[PDB]
Symmetry: D2
Subunit: 494 residues, 4 copies
């Protein structure tokens, strides 16, 4: 029941969003955005700069002053504003899905049924938490009355990736606005249009000026300026590991602001010999090739027991060869183009390196179309732990299948990594499922499923995959600082 | 590593415990306690009366007055007192286990390794919750500061059964003293000695006078007096369904005091065809014959699929025939005598009725010894749902095995009862385990185990098995009334 | 900004609401509803009966069966349905306010700005809690994995009073539908129209058939049938103490169903000599004369220190004499008529008895209009604790002012009652405020304010004022039964 | 009731504690510890090095492996071990207090009645949280069963300051061992003996080898090695701001390990004109001169309204001049010597700079004794915001009194700082207290009290004073990583 899409929607939101008004860059420099399906320029977006970041941060700080309309606003009213924003987004669902498809390149059906549905669910979920994050009345010793108040941390600088523009923007705006903070958001240079349109919808919803500010920046300049600003109380970053380390170093060296990181990973996928063959094959294919493999928790490493290795490999190759690649607006299309040329060339180089290392190429391994950044679904068999493709995040539609013999060995091999963002287990035995769920050192473990993301369930990673959580009640912890008030009383009684 | 027991320990605590002092009954009437292993009288215990209950309630109310030492005491100090009581109980572990064996009749090894260990664990667990039951700072609308304070409900009247004297006494004293309440406890007429010795230990521990009061009463007179007293803010009862209904009616007609009930049940046990045969048989035998079958959550109904019915029945009969019955102080003894003559005759009548109804008698079915209340382990096969033994709680060492064909049918048959205290599932499939755990209408569901009781895990029952919970954090809810305080502030800010 | 009201709105919802359809009474008997402002009949409403209650309970049980659309519905979808119902109610806000004014008699401005605003706030608040009531993963000892699941209790029978039809209906429907229960509601015979229109809106919102059922019954027959039905898992009652005791006795004697009571009270009001005179006088007048004094937590007892007794009495008399009584639809009207003739005559008799007992009559004390149930604002001075008016709930616009000398004496006198529903303290000292808030034995304590009701803040009473809470997170506890699932694991690790 | 102290207790614990065994430094280098009361050397302590840190971290990682005794240990058993450690510490309370006095220089009465009492309270409090930190069973959408498990973060490197050796060591060990982590602790070079004796007591208590490891290091070498080690999952630091920034930078550049900081502050103290004069003066004196002013939350800035400035200044000077300085083991002694010569010279330089800036010297300002690091109590009046002493943390017995006129001005001046660790308000008005508690940007706010530290109440700071909390339930969050497990089920029901 997908409505008819407009393949070339109009683009007008291309400036910096500050104080519920659109301002051009101080340097007047603009950067172009490229449609990945065809390689042509969609529109020109103003390039964020350090001075623009300073203006946005000053506006946010002014909006966060004590006694301001945002600070005096009731929590239930903040939830009502979030619900109003969600309703406004749902009103323009078709246009937002079309713009997301045009800018990112993901299939329109996926954008309409998955991305925007999850955005609405996340916004409406964090609308509820506005007036339900209670404190505590501490029963301290002596004739004292102690209690804790949950207060907004302050100005929050948020940097979102390009794989899920709307979804990550919702995940960042939900808890921040629910807890009463002000946001100075930096969007990815690849996909800036959807965030700007959402900012216009935010202005329409009725948020006070300066609460939400979006600065579209082209490069690490705006991100570094946000992470190094003194008035930014907290910085939240989601992206590559190197940029995350740079942001953390800059934040620690600037004002010791709170830092929350959500980096990439090398999430494994374990298939036990007793698992349902068809369901396991389909779920592994979906886990690896979802969003053209541009997922932080993609199941790149697929561990299959020696008993069912041959049949699983054959079924996976057959399924991958039948995947449809083409124009995302087409109904039959299952895989769209890559986000940009850089990722296209990086994935091609990764495929070439994997072929050089001796991994068996089962299918794909080349360009899918002469125009656009389309890559054929690639599957690598007989992959070893020493191979580069088995250790680095390809971040593309490349499948690697590894063989294991015993459960202890597969646990040791899966946990032998610097990333613990996610993991999966496919089996029908209760004991094996429990043991694998407990032993695996992953932030999220899925049993007989994959990519089951809910706003209620927190998401995070161990080791160097990041720190903290971004979903559920745990997400509210990062955007809140606890204040303890102790009052002397004439006499305390139980 | 069980220490050498004293088969005839001295009994001196046989009076009413009020205000940390021992008082005789006002009417000077005493009731005898009978050793179940031999049928002889152990000692004479003063019989509780309505006037004695009034004296105990007056003492408790005096100890609960505002500004009293108990009310002004810090929560951490209450936890320290609970830990001190637990240490004192552990110091006299051997004597308490011997007295429990002498009075109840359960094996000494069980009393030392299971009952007292669980008592210590429960006391030390509820010691921790003394200063960790926080309130909430409600984020109400408007310029108001609202918060909730958890206060003791008041004088609590508690009636404990005879199957687990020490364990039920600990389960009742833990949350009540942890939340800062005063206790007026009524103990079972069958096993009153252990509770009185524990009361003496409570006096030694250092509790303020009047905090804990124990009135040993012979019959429903003391229980009715406690449940109908006006100064009793809350009544907690654990026992038969009829007495629970009477207590609830009296409490509702007296002063609308809060009532918490924990009645018996007819907990089923389901064995799937794919379950581990040896483990399932052993766990079913332990589930049904634990504590001579005198358990509220005994797995009386054993549902076995038609595929493994014959082998399971044969193994269960073989295991039951090998059970050792004899003197509880003997090391090799596995089953002791019944609590009293009334239960002995009731179980004999139930066995006779089951034989009359046409159920196949596999083993046992008669008296085990010429002296004492010993009953042979009885197993009934080919039991139908219409049989009386399949519907009423025998509360004895009688095993009933029922046959089922499909999982939907077994769910419908197991849930077709007025009791939902507990249930069990034995299987190796994940989907079957999850579906059975979700479908069964039981307060507690065990998978591949039984009688796994932890102080942390709450315990309760659905339907007419009772209301509320007695373990874990949920146990603290019943013994606490919430007070909300709202204060007008000059200006509220997030 | 109150829209123009329709003084005589059309009435069409006058039948029994079962399975999203309107059915006449089986006996075809109808009872009339009387407009309190004029004494004329508004419409004829079908009279509920035991057979109709049985039909509604059967429909609710059918809708609550495992696998039904309501049971399989996601929690977030239940919250969305609640939000949709709130939006539908807000769409017809003017008509609902006009009908509430026509049926109850409260001023239209109050109905539009207070009652319906609170109804919308409560519904939207309990919409949020749909998917945020998590369980617990208990860390039990041994190689076991234990967790708790919060499940709906089942069919809930709810009886609502007549003072706040829409507000109490929302307070009952919020948590019940949020936790996934089915409702069989019994409405007051005085004000049945608004609940039926809300039921029609519920049908329009999209709830599955049988989830919500409303049976308008004339008398205690329907209430007794609901409280004594075997398929009703939980009964919630809000009203007089005697009917609450009867309901509790019947429920305990029928199937031991869970009972939650919210009865009336004699809430005191304490004015300290250092309090702000104008604010204290205005808040006391609002506390006592709100909703024509037809509030369960009305500040009937007004304790004023001897220092400011004369000035407070003079100001209270002056304020009471200036209160406007007349047609509720008039803008200048501040007090409407009483709910029915019975309350009118009872309040007149209470005023006569208070005059006979020797209490000084300061103002009012008679009928306010020759047509309708209008009573002049009455104030009684020099009231003693032994007077009947100082002990019984008049439930009308009668003010009683009592004098106290010391804070300990006023605490002792205020707590010397069988009701603890609410209390208030007016002062500027921190120590006095804290001591009074801690010492008073009231379910809710207000400081320098009164009737500050928020959906987030729980509401309840001590002693015989009721049991349990109806607002906030505490409200969800009553409509939920906890199931514990313990699974044996091969090996447990921290 | 302070027992007789041994002024020169024996010192034997002077090595590195690894695997429950004492090992000398690999380089065999030892650093001396100096008694502050006399300036003589107490004993020689082995100097920690990077290689020793590597050995300790390897031992901790070995003890943290899956299936190890520490990992398989029950949570209740961890709480029991913590309680056993607390009991062992209480057994040697006198010796520990004497050693603390000998090494730190604080008065023996303070060490016995305050420091060790708080250590015991903290240990026994965190013993309770061992088996009470539940997870959540997330109600996710779809046919899925999702839940969260709280797991230990891993090897934790902890660096403790010298002002409160035992208290900070307990604050670090409590949550870390309660949540099931392994500790590699670095102690201050000034006071290493007490931590080593506590480590010996830990070995005696029965902790498995490698769970707790203490490396006494002389300088930033050991701290940098701990913060830069790859196997250290989390680092917790408490000390100066510069070292905290260095540690955060190193941790971010090494492996992105979680960092928790608790730095110093410039906590203000506000005295309103209506506050109790005697209580305010005494509490301000205690707040500033507690522990010789070597407190992170010392009330250095004392804001006094112009109405009571003169009387408050006179009373503060009179109280400060009467403070007793001398040998800490003497009963009449109220203030001991400084921790070391460096702090002595820094405080002298700060006093000289304050005198140069034009601040009025009221009393003190020089050396108190010819032997030892004793400083006279110094009070500075007419202090301005531009003065250096009013902005930098003197960390000594220097009092600064500032004058303010209005409440808005004092709020603006108090919040105009880079530190928000703590604040205090002294008044009798309710509105002023609430407004000041809400407006002040401090981690902890005290009303009519100061330094009211309870294990239950969390402690932290805003701005650059640190991040996170170290006490209460909030303390457990830092030492725990959340794992989410989602399992597909055949059919989900509410």
């Amino acid at each position: 029941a997908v409505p008819a899409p407009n393949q070339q929607p109009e683009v007008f939101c291309n400036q910096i969003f500050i104080n519920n008004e659109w301002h051009d860059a101080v340097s007047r420099k603009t950067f172009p955005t490229v449609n990945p399906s065809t390689g042509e320029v969609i529109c020109q977006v103003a390039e964020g700069d350090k001075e623009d970041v300073d203006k946005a941060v000053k506006a946010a700080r002014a909006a966060f002053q004590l006694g301001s309309p945002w600070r005096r606003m009731d929590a239930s009213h903040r939830g009502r504003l979030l619900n109003r924003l969600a309703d406004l987004i749902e009103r323009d669902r078709t246009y937002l899905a079309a713009l997301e498809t045009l800018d990112n390149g993901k299939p329109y059906v996926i954008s309409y049924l998955v991305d925007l549905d999850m955005v609405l669910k996340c916004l409406r979920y964090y609308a509820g938490w506005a007036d339900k994050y209670h404190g505590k009345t501490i029963p301290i010793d002596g004739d004292f009355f102690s209690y804790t108040r949950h207060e907004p941390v302050g100005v929050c600088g948020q940097i979102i990736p390009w794989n899920f523009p709307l979804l990550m923007q919702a995940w960042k705006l939900g808890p921040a606005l629910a807890t009463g903070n002000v946001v100075v958001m930096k969007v990815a240079e690849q996909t800036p249009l959807t965030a700007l349109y959402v900012a216009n919808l935010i202005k329409e919803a009725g948020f006070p000026p300066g609460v939400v500010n979006i600065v579209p920046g082209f490069g690490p300049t705006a991100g570094a300026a946000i992470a190094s600003h003194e008035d930014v109380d907290k910085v939240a970053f989601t992206g590559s590991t190197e940029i995350g380390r740079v942001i953390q170093v800059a934040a620690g060296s600037s004002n010791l602001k709170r830092v929350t990181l959500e980096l990439g990973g090398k999430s494994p996928n374990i298939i036990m010999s007793d698992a349902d063959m068809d369901w396991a094959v389909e779920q592994a294919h979906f886990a690896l090739f979802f969003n053209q493999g541009q997922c932080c928790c993609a199941g790149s490493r697929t561990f299959v027991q020696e008993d069912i290795y041959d049949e699983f490999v054959e079924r996976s190759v057959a399924r991958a060869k039948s995947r449809v690649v083409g124009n995302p607006f087409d109904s039959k299309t299952e895989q769209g183009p890559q986000v940009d040329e850089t990722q296209f060339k990086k994935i091609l180089g990764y495929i070439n390196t994997g072929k050089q290392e001796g991994a068996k190429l089962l299918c794909g391994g080349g360009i899918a179309a002469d125009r656009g950044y389309f890559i054929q679904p690639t599957v690598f068999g007989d992959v070893q732990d020493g191979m580069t493709i088995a250790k680095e995040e390809i971040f593309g539609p490349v499948m690697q299948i590894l063989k294991f013999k015993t459960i202890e060995e597969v646990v040791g091999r899966a946990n032998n990594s610097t990333y613990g963002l996610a993991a999966a287990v496919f089996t029908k035995d209760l004991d094996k499922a429990n043991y694998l769920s407990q032993a695996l050192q992953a932030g999220t473990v899925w049993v007989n499923c994959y990519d089951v993301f809910g706003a209620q369930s927190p998401f995070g990673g161990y080791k160097m995959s990041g720190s903290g959580r971004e979903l559920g009640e745990y997400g509210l912890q990062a955007y809140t600082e606890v204040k303890t008030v102790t009052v002397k009383v004439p006499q305390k009684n139980s």
